[PDB]
């Protein structure tokens, strides 16, 4: 593994080394059967289903491990830590609630399976295979269930609407998120957000990670896809203070460390939760990568605070402890309290395009899918009158949008044409890459620019011509 230097043969000569591997499937079966029985002790009516739940969880974990090997992608590692996180999630869901039928339990179980074993996937057929396996295993182990209710496709869990973490309809969730966006536009920065189902799922994922302590998530996906904008959205909606490091060519290691000290003292002394958004553009050196590795592993980096900075940090820690209600004199206890405060209050989120993997959460934002692109097309080409009564439905439709109405209206057809033009840009860039010529990554920022240019041209030329008319 990287950063791991094999030790001197002289040292190996002394110390015997024993290999501690991933537990076997039966070992996992027992290990988490005990946890599942303890968890389902919360609801006695569901205690007889604990063992088959463990069997299904183990079977799905083994399928995912045997199918999604690390060779395909560096982050395709599934450890028993993921299974523990699974059980912890099911427990956090089941705790505030008092009763559930089997169907609600299996909905929670499938939701956690989606959030752990499917959110990290890059390619779409991988996600389809994951969904198929989840449904199949839920059928095999849990036959006497109504499959429509238990695993209804819009598996969206949220607590913004109800008091608890019960499933939320995508349409009602869309209405609520629209209202919260209206507040966001009114108070913070104003750019248009169109709420395709992908944004709903991704905002739910970002919020779920934010709400938990020591929340660190890996926002990997093509630039312009809304990762940092959705991150700021969830940060404001959840009260968290968004922070990105202003990075330029002058920005050396020392300025990075000063910003690190600022955010660390804010999230460990003032008890101010801070969402630290970081980008590959902000990482000018692998030193930044190793410092963040240490911060994510231990919850604090000893290399930040020394000397005068150490003394000021301990003064701030003493003041904060006096305000909170904890009386600690020595520097070590205050350091431990401040480390706990940071690990409970700071949430870092990393935006991209085996330790951090399996110690964080990687969500594959990817690029806007056909549905998303088509909703983009409508929403921003809503103002202009792209409505022609003379339009004749062609016998054959390229049908780039799958869910296009069977009669396409004029606006629907032209927005389909825009989605097609983006798809063909992707195909042309892919062909240029295959031929080996230099290519350039086509982003949804290009799509937004294209729509804006369309609106400007249509408005100007239609205006002049109609002025002549």
């Amino acid at each position: 593994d990287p950063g791991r230097k094999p030790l001197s043969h002289r040292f190996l000569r002394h110390v015997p080394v024993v290999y501690v591997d991933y537990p076997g499937p039966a070992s996992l079966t027992q290990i988490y059967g005990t946890f599942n029985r303890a968890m389902l002790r919360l609801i006695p009516s569901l205690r007889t289903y604990a063992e088959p739940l463990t069997a299904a969880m183990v079977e799905f974990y083994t399928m995912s491990q045997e199918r999604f090997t690390q060779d395909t992608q560096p982050h395709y590692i599934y450890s028993p830590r993921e299974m523990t996180r699974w059980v912890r999630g099911i427990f956090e869901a089941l705790r505030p609630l008092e009763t559930l039928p089997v169907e609600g339990l299996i909905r929670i179980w499938a939701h956690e399976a989606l959030r752990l074993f499917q959110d990290r996937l890059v390619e779409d057929e991988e996600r389809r295979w994951t969904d198929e396996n989840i449904d199949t295993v839920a059928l095999k182990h849990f036959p006497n269930i109504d499959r429509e209710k238990a695993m209804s496709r819009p598996i969206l869990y949220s607590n913004w609407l109800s008091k608890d973490y019960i499933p939320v309809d995508q349409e009602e969730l869309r209405d609520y998120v629209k209202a919260r966006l209206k507040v966001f536009y009114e108070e913070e920065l104003d750019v248009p957000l169109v709420l395709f189902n992908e944004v709903l799922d991704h905002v739910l994922r970002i919020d779920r990670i934010f709400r938990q302590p020591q929340g660190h998530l890996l926002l990997i996906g093509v630039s312009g896809a809304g990762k940092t904008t959705l991150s700021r959205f969830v940060a404001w909606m959840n009260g968290l203070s968004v922070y990105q490091i202003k990075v330029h060519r002058k920005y050396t290691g020392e300025d990075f460390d000063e910003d690190l000290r600022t955010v660390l003292r804010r999230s460990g002394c003032k008890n101010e939760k801070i969402a630290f958004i970081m980008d590959e553009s902000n990482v000018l050196d692998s030193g930044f990568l190793e410092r963040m590795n240490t911060l994510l592993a231990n919850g604090e980096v000893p290399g930040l605070f020394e000397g005068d900075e150490y003394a000021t940090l301990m003064t701030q820690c003493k003041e904060g402890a006096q305000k909170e209600g904890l009386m600690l004199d020595s520097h070590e206890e205050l350091y431990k309290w401040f480390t706990s405060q940071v690990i409970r209050n700071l949430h870092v989120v990393f935006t991209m395009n085996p330790a951090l993997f399996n110690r964080c959460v990687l969500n594959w934002f990817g690029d806007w899918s056909t549905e998303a692109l088509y909703q983009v097309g409508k929403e921003f080409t809503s103002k202009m009158d792209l409505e022609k009564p003379n339009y004749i439905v062609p016998d054959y439709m390229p049908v780039v949008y799958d869910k296009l109405p069977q009669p396409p209206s004029h606006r629907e057809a032209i927005v389909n044409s825009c989605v097609f033009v983006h798809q063909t840009l992707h195909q042309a860039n892919a062909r240029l890459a295959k031929r080996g010529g230099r290519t350039m990554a086509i982003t949804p920022r290009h799509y937004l620019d294209f729509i804006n240019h369309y609106a400007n041209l249509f408005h100007e030329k239609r205006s002049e011509l109609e002025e002549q008319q």
Partner: protein
């Protein structure tokens, strides 16, 4: 202050401030005298420390001043330093005149009394005895040529050759018997010098040269001494071909001299013409062929002092610039080491600097701008730059070239072997040199292997010492059984192929891997046929080893038996401890090292009766500053490091540990960061230097011992 007495332009500016602070302390200036001179290590002073009586070298050989300089009369540091230099030059010149008188009395004689020759040799320093020999030989050959100039005249050149031959026989007799090591080095320098003189005289007699202006005599270096000259500096004039130079009259201490190879005299001629044409030389060629060493030897023969700027990562710029301007002020020579290893911008910077200085030199054929200072280039200034294939473009038109592609190894191995009193030196050299050519190729390559020319020279030295020990042992035996003792009689009946084989075994067989040993035996069979060497077991030590192995639960065996190879390795360890004060037991982890040296220490203590005390120190665990000692930024106080602490403890001899045997086992990895300061101990100097200025001598019982697992980062130095 800097301009006056420019000799401390060499030492650092912080060290210059240190010297200014210690101006009222002559005992703290010894490091600076080490730095700025060639072989000078300390100035001899009286108990008052108010007048400098003389100077010494690293080897302990000391020069007494004809007129000592009273520091009280000249309180200024620069004034009395300049007086010290002037008086050292004058004293060296006067001692040279005396020694040349003594040898020319010794010369032109049918026979030489060994007692008088040894007395004269001990009277003067090694450099002065070699130089007086050269002056006398040159004057004799010049006089013989002047007599021959009648045209077809009979030759007193035969007489001069006979004189050199009989003196050479005297030296070959004297080196054989036990002598003090300093006089041994003097004898070795004299014998190699006289071998060169004999060979050039043979060339002259073969070519039937008749005229003192004939170019065949003009090519060979001629030394002219002019005692009538009022200025002592100019009294000696060294001249080769067209070029002529004055003698630098700077102390060399004792230096390793060269065999004066045909390649070496070719280089001497080319460089001497180059400086005559007022431009430096660039003797390129593969590393290890004596380029840097040949330049050093040429500067030494002129009496000028050479600065070897090693060009590696350790190379600096500001320090190089200041020592460079100092080179220009004083007139000493400077020989860059491998230049192509420099950084490109580094290379361009130093190239522009040396180009400016060289343009100043050709102008003098006068000041040049160095660090915004106009510097009067001394005409004696010279710059050499060895390369390993080229010269920067700004320097191609300023510097000559020469290909030192291959020094004659046979001549070197013959001259040095003859310098050790070996008979049949030519046969042994013509055997050993092809053998070392075989070793560098046929043997499996390893990082620690070194079959370079220096390794050959070391093997020859070891063989000479082995022969001396054997003749001493035979003399003791003959004294016990009988009384008929005659050194020549023992030497005549003393095999020398066996001596060379034993030496090569004792120095190279330990370095061999488990597979190369049969290959070395086959090579010895090929080059030295029929002659084999069987190491005499140390039966008392073998019994002590068996008893110690029994006491430590270790296994013991003899040869083929289980543990035999480990036992042999222990014995080789003992031999290297006997013949070396520095050791390295290289081997993969858990091979034999700790147990081998522990068992040998205990067996030695139980045999010889000398207590064994070991200070196992791991070098990497402790920081380098903490290993040797820390420097106080304010008071310079010496918090002696762990190794410095144990060495000082042993030196102070509080509990009689000098009588005890001390092994400082440096268990751990070895890198060229800490060992750079310890390299000053593993040489023949056997002394430790510290950044305060205090120097500690290694007691003979202390055996520096490196227990390492591998040498991927061990410098070949």
């Amino acid at each position: 202050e800097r301009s006056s007495f420019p000799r401390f332009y060499f030492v650092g500016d912080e060290d210059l401030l240190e010297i200014i602070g210690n101006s009222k302390n002559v005992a703290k200036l010894q490091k600076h005298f080490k730095k700025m001179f060639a072989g000078v290590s300390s100035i001899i002073l009286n108990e008052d420390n108010s007048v400098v009586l003389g100077i010494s070298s690293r080897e302990g050989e000391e020069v007494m001043f004809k007129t000592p300089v009273s520091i009280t009369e000249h309180p200024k540091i620069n004034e009395w330093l300049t007086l010290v230099e002037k008086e050292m030059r004058v004293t060296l010149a006067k001692l040279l005149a005396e020694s040349v008188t003594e040898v020319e009395i010794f010369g032109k004689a049918t026979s030489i009394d060994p007692n008088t020759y040894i007395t004269w040799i001990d009277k003067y320093q090694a450099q002065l005895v070699v130089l007086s020999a050269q002056i006398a030989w040159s004057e004799n050959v010049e006089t013989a040529l002047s007599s021959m100039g009648g045209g077809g005249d009979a030759a007193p050149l035969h007489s001069v050759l006979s004189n050199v031959e009989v003196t050479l026989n005297v030296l070959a007799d004297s080196v054989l018997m036990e002598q003090p090591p300093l006089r041994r080095r003097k004898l070795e320098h004299l014998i190699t010098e006289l071998v060169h003189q004999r060979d050039v005289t043979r060339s002259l007699i073969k070519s039937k040269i008749d005229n003192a202006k004939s170019f065949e005599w003009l090519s060979q270096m001629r030394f002219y001494f002019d005692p009538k000259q009022t200025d002592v500096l100019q009294q000696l004039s060294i001249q080769m071909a067209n070029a002529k130079f004055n003698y630098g009259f700077e102390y060399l201490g004792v230096q390793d001299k060269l065999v004066q190879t045909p390649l070496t005299d070719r280089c001497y001629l080319t460089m001497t013409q180059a400086l005559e044409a007022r431009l430096g030389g660039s003797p390129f060629g593969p590393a290890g062929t004596g380029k840097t060493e040949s330049v050093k030897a040429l500067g030494h023969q002129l009496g000028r002092f050479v600065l070897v700027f090693n060009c590696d990562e350790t190379f600096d710029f500001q320090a190089m610039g200041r020592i460079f301007v100092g080179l220009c002020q004083v007139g000493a020579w400077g020989c860059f080491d491998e230049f192509n290893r420099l950084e490109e911008r580094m290379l361009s910077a130093v190239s522009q600097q040396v180009q400016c200085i060289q343009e100043a030199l050709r102008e003098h054929s006068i000041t040049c701008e160095l660090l915004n200072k106009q510097v009067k280039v001394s005409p004696d200034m010279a710059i050499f730059i060895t390369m390993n294939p080229n010269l920067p473009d700004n320097l191609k038109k300023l510097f000559r070239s020469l290909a030192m592609t291959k020094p004659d190894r046979q001549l070197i191995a013959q001259v040095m072997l003859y310098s050790q009193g070996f008979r049949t030196a030519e046969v042994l050299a013509n055997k050993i040199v092809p053998f070392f050519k075989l070793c560098d190729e046929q043997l499996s390559s390893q990082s620690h292997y070194d079959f370079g020319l220096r390794a050959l020279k070391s093997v020859l030295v070891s063989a000479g010492n082995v022969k001396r020990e054997r003749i001493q042992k035979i003399k003791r035996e003959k004294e016990e059984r009988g009384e008929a003792v005659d050194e020549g009689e023992i030497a005549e009946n003393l095999p020398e192929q066996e001596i060379l084989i034993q030496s090569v075994c004792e120095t190279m067989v330990p370095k061999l891997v488990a597979e190369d040993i049969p290959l070395l035996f086959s090579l010895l069979s090929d080059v030295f046929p029929g002659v084999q060497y069987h190491r005499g077991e140390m039966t008392a030590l073998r019994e002590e080893l068996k008893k110690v192995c029994q006491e430590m639960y270790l296994t013991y065996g003899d040869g083929e038996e289980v543990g035999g190879m480990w036992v042999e390795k222990v014995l080789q360890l003992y031999q290297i401890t006997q013949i070396n004060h520095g050791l390295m037991m290289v081997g993969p982890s858990g091979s034999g090292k700790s147990m081998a040296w522990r068992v040998l220490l205990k067996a030695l203590e139980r045999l010889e009766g000398v207590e064994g005390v070991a200070h196992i120190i791991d070098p990497k665990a402790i920081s380098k500053d903490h290993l040797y000692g820390t420097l106080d930024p304010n008071t310079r106080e010496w918090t002696d490091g762990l190794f410095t602490h144990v060495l000082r403890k042993i030196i102070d001899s509080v509990r009689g540990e000098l009588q005890k045997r001390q092994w400082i086992v440096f268990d751990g990895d070895v890198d060229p960061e800490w060992v750079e300061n310890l390299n000053s101990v593993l040489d023949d100097n056997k002394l430790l230097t510290l950044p305060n200025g205090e120097r500690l001598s290694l007691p003979p019982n202390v055996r520096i011992m490196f227990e390492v697992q591998d040498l991927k980062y061990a410098t070949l130095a």
